Amino acid sequence: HEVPSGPNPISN
């Protein structure tokens, strides 16, 4: 996971 702020990268 890079930085799409979706598939629990950091935004989770």
Write the DSSP string, 1-12. Answer: --S-SSSSSS--
**In the structure encoding, which two tokens stand for residue 9, read together?**
């990268």
Distance from chain centroid for Cα 4: 5
Length of the chain equals 12
The dihedral over CA atoms of 4, 6, 10, 12, expressed in degrees to the nearest 10, equals 170
With tokens 């950091």, the residue in question is 10
